[PDB]
């Protein structure tokens, strides 16, 4: 969205192109290379031709959700709405909500011509991008592009405070660091590892 | 060690705590819990092991202490009994019969020969080809008679026979394993 010299706001789409021959980081970088053009304004001809697909973002503001229209020449428009907690627990404690496990969620929309796309596989396309926001594999290339030294927070479902009590298993943690947290630290200035020797358990 | 230092009293005793899964058990009391560490880590073997960075390999040596040593059998006590007497019996002839060997007596130390027969044996019902032995002049002959296999006639008859190397048979009481075992010779630089 570019506001015009009168002051009325119009949108218009600009397209990042050859997009299934880069990584995160090649991603990120064209991404923000059309995001800076638009706003000191050298955006070219070439820039608004050959569109695909297209993403489209209501939840800025706070919408749940949208049905947005399809301009002809494609085949699906992709929409993303809010990501806040339902409208039932907007007043709820935030000690209430952690007791539970109550998380916030994301719901994403698909639009497409019928003559061309079948609803199986619009159905098969949501369901993975669902397994992808929550999958090990996507995270860890992430994380490699942008040179993250952690491993990444991983999915599970809440466990009860039955058997050993989580004070002690917090406890457990301030020890393993303060014994075994040498094998981990920013301590190499090159990125290189021995190939020959053999690499430490570092589980704990 | 002590149980002031962890902020626990006499008055603990008899009352029930969560151990996760510590001999076995998910609850146990502090009697217990005293009873069985004291049983493992405190009385005629003491061990070190937790510095080890491997988690498997922590864990195999920490159920096997923590089982502690089996019962032996009246056989297998009796057959300590044999080697001990052997081991004192060779001591009395060589300090009787031969001058100059104060030097190199094991008096004190006589448990070697039952140690070294018990990691021998159990090397050859692994199914293992041979063992190989180095060590300095103190109780040399001793193992020369006693774990080699050499004859009195063959040890007492140019160096002396206290750096020369020897090679022997070990058959296995209680099974059907054999395996070789060989001497090194060495100087008397350490
Ligand atoms: C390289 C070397 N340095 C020093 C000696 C001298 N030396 C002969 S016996 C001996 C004592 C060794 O004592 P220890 O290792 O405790 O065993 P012990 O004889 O009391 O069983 C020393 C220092 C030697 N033989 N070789």
């Given at each position: 969205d570019?506001?015009?010299?009168?002051?009325?706001?119009?949108?218009?789409?600009?397209?990042?192109?050859?997009?299934?021959?880069?990584?995160?980081?090649?991603?990120?970088?064209?991404?923000?290379?059309?995001?800076?053009?638009?706003?000191?304004?050298?955006?070219?001809?070439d820039?608004?031709?050959?569109?695909?697909?297209?993403?489209?973002?209501?939840?800025?503001?706070?919408?749940?959700?949208?049905?947005?229209?399809?301009?002809?020449?494609?085949?699906?428009?992709?929409?993303?709405?809010?990501?806040?907690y339902?409208?039932?627990?907007?007043?709820?404690?935030?000690?209430?909500?952690?007791?539970?496990?109550?998380?916030?969620?994301?719901?994403?929309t698909?639009?497409?011509?019928?003559?061309?796309?079948?609803?199986?596989?619009?159905?098969?396309?949501?369901?993975?991008?669902?397994?992808?926001?929550?999958?090990?594999?996507?995270?860890?290339?992430?994380?490699?592009?942008?040179?993250?030294?952690?491993?990444?927070?991983?999915?599970?479902?809440?466990?009860?405070?039955?058997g050993?009590?989580?004070?002690?298993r917090?406890?457990?943690?301030?020890?393993?660091?303060?014994?075994?947290?040498?094998?981990?630290?920013?301590?190499?200035?090159?990125?290189?590892?021995?190939?020959?020797?053999?690499?430490?358990?570092?589980?704990? | 060690?002590?149980?002031?230092?962890?902020?626990?009293?006499?008055?603990?005793?008899?009352?029930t705590?969560?151990?996760?899964?510590?001999?076995?058990?998910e609850?146990?009391?502090?009697?217990?819990?005293?009873?069985?560490?004291?049983?493992?880590?405190?009385?005629?073997?003491?061990?070190?092991?937790?510095?080890?960075?491997?988690?498997?390999?922590?864990?195999?040596?920490?159920?096997?202490?923590?089982?502690?040593?089996?019962?032996?059998?009246?056989?297998?006590?009796?057959?300590?009994?044999?080697?001990?007497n052997?081991?004192?019996?060779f001591?009395?002839?060589?300090?009787?019969?031969?001058?100059?060997?104060?030097?190199?007596?094991?008096?004190?130390?006589?448990?070697?020969?039952?140690?070294?027969?018990?990691?021998?044996?159990?090397?050859?019902?692994?199914?293992?080809?041979?063992?190989?032995?180095?060590?300095?002049?103190?109780?040399?002959?001793n193992?020369?008679?006693?774990?080699?296999?050499?004859?009195?006639?063959?040890?007492?008859?140019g160096?002396?026979?206290?750096?020369?190397?020897?090679?022997?048979?070990?058959?296995?009481?209680?099974?059907?394993?054999?395996?070789?075992?060989?001497?090194?010779?060495?100087?008397?630089?350490?």
């Amino acid at each position: 969205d570019l506001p015009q010299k009168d002051g009325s706001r119009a949108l218009v789409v600009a397209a990042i192109k050859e997009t299934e021959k880069m990584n995160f980081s090649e991603f990120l970088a064209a991404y923000e290379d059309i995001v800076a053009r638009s706003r000191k304004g050298k955006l070219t001809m070439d820039d608004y031709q050959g569109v695909t697909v297209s993403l489209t973002n209501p939840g800025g503001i706070g919408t749940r959700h949208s049905v947005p229209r399809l301009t002809k020449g494609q085949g699906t428009i992709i929409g993303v709405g809010s990501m806040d907690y339902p409208a039932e627990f907007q007043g709820a404690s935030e000690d209430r909500l952690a007791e539970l496990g109550v998380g916030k969620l994301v719901t994403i929309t698909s639009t497409y011509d019928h003559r061309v796309i079948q609803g199986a596989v619009s159905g098969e396309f949501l369901r993975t991008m669902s397994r992808l926001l929550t999958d090990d594999s996507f995270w860890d290339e992430i994380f490699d592009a942008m040179n993250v030294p952690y491993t990444p927070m991983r999915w599970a479902q809440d466990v009860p405070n039955t058997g050993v009590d989580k004070n002690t298993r917090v406890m457990q943690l301030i020890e393993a660091y303060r014994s075994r947290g040498h094998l981990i630290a920013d301590t190499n200035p090159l990125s290189w590892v021995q190939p020959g020797m053999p690499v430490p358990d570092h589980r704990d | 060690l002590d149980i002031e230092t962890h902020n626990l009293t006499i008055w603990d005793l008899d009352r029930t705590f969560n151990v996760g899964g510590f001999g076995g058990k998910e609850t146990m009391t502090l009697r217990e819990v005293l009873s069985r560490l004291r049983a493992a880590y405190t009385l005629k073997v003491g061990s070190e092991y937790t510095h080890i960075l491997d988690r498997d390999e922590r864990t195999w040596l920490q159920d096997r202490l923590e089982a502690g040593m089996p019962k032996p059998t009246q056989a297998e006590q009796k057959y300590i009994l044999q080697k001990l007497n052997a081991a004192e019996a060779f001591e009395n002839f060589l300090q009787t019969k031969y001058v100059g060997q104060k030097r190199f007596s094991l008096e004190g130390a006589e448990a070697l020969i039952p140690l070294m027969d018990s990691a021998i044996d159990t090397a050859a019902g692994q199914g293992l080809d041979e063992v190989v032995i180095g060590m300095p002049h103190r109780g040399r002959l001793n193992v020369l008679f006693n774990i080699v296999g050499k004859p009195l006639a063959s040890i007492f008859n140019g160096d002396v026979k206290y750096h020369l190397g020897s090679e022997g048979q070990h058959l296995q009481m209680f099974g059907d394993g054999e395996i070789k075992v060989s001497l090194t010779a060495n100087p008397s630089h350490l």
